[PDB]
Design an enzyme around this catalytic site. Structure first.
Site, short mmCIF file in Angstrom:
data_model
loop_
_atom_site.label_atom_id
_atom_site.label_comp_id
_atom_site.label_asym_id
_atom_site.label_seq_id
_atom_site.Cartn_x
_atom_site.Cartn_y
_atom_site.Cartn_z
N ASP A 134 0.86 -1.22 0.00
CA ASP A 134 0.00 0.00 0.00
C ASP A 134 0.88 1.25 0.00
O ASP A 134 0.49 2.24 -0.64
CB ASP A 134 -0.94 0.00 1.21
CG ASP A 134 -2.33 -0.56 0.94
OD1 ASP A 134 -2.47 -1.38 0.04
OD2 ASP A 134 -3.27 -0.12 1.62
N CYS A 141 -1.99 0.41 -13.44
CA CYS A 141 -2.12 0.48 -11.96
C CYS A 141 -3.34 1.40 -11.76
O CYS A 141 -4.32 1.24 -12.50
CB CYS A 141 -0.78 0.88 -11.37
SG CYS A 141 -0.02 2.31 -12.16
N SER A 147 3.23 0.99 -13.23
CA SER A 147 3.12 0.64 -14.67
C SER A 147 4.43 1.02 -15.35
O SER A 147 5.00 0.23 -16.12
CB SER A 147 1.95 1.35 -15.30
OG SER A 147 0.70 0.86 -14.83
#
Ligand SMILES: Cc1cc(C)nc(Nc2ccc(N)cc2)n1
Length: 281
Positions: A180, A214, A221
């Protein structure tokens, strides 16, 4: 050689400084189609726009716009479509683009929910028996199989053009363990993932360009395409150490803004290429 340049930047803690020179040197091209008022709800972030010159056009006469860019790496003979995670209202456009561009693979580098917010629409079916129909673009999508592993999931999908009754198999490669906050500690699972995408044939010139996303289609990406292209250039060149990551990143930034969002993602990219080079030499 980048391994020495890595130790230098690391021991000197200059990652913010390198990252800023790249920011400063980056191309800036018009993105007028993205900013038209009729396209406001086709963009997830108002500061992430495809350039007009490299933007993917939908073959629908009404509105041809999707937030997606073709990144053409001439020397590596590799193309990628980088796009945003689809919105509830662009899932049909997303699959239309996959169809029109003859893509064989979709690479997803985010979870649908991260930090308690939705990063992406659920754009594929969760169960074999519950297929999805996109009425706006006349496409049916079916889950054929799903292979869940620790770090990623591969899905076989069938995409059917309801207009012509042609069908194609699409591979969905979903990296599920990007944390995250920050970047993975080790690039090992990311490299494994990348070699798996390569092994599928999804990055091969027989097929249309792979679709990579993404949430914004620039950060994770970016790391995916940068790593793949640098490793391929190291196979191809007489002198592998002639490969300058920063130069490759700047070349890719002519095609889509903001590729690699943080100094951490830049550091991680170096580490991924440095480690990948061992499994290639
Ligand atoms: C057959 C079927 C059944 C259901 C519940 N949804 C769909 N399509 C769909 C379209 C657009 C979005 N955003 C998501 C799903 N299709």
């Amino acid at each position: 050689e980048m391994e020495k340049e890595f130790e230098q930047i690391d021991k000197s803690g200059s990652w913010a400084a390198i990252y800023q020179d790249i920011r400063h040197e980056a191309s800036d091209f018009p993105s007028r189609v993205a900013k038209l008022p009729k396209n406001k709800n086709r963009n997830r972030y108002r500061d992430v726009s495809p350039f007009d010159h490299s933007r993917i056009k939908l073959h629908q006469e009404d509105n041809d716009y999707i937030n997606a860019s073709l990144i053409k790496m001439e020397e590596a003979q590799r193309s990628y479509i980088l796009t945003q995670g689809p919105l509830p209202n662009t899932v049909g456009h997303f699959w239309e683009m996959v169809w029109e561009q003859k893509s064989r693979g979709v690479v997803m580098l985010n979870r649908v929910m991260e930090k308690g917010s939705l990063k992406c629409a659920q754009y594929w079916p969760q169960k074999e028996e519950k297929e999805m129909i996109f009425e706006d673009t006349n496409l049916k999508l079916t889950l054929i199989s799903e292979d869940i592993k620790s770090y990623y999931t591969v899905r076989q999908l069938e995409l059917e053009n309801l207009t012509t009754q042609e069908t194609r198999e699409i591979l969905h490669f979903h990296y599920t363990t990007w944390p995250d906050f920050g970047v993975p500690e080790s690039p090992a699972s990311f490299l494994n993932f990348l070699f798996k995408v390569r092994e599928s044939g999804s990055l091969s010139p027989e097929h249309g360009p792979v679709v990579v996303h993404c949430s914004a289609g620039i950060g994770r990406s970016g790391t995916f395409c940068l790593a793949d292209t640098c490793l391929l250039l190291m196979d191809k060149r007489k002198d592998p150490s002639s490969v300058d990551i920063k130069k490759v990143l700047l070349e890719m930034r002519k095609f889509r803004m903001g590729l690699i969002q943080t100094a951490d993602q830049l550091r991680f990219s170096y580490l991924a290429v440095i480690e990948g080079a061992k499994f290639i030499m």
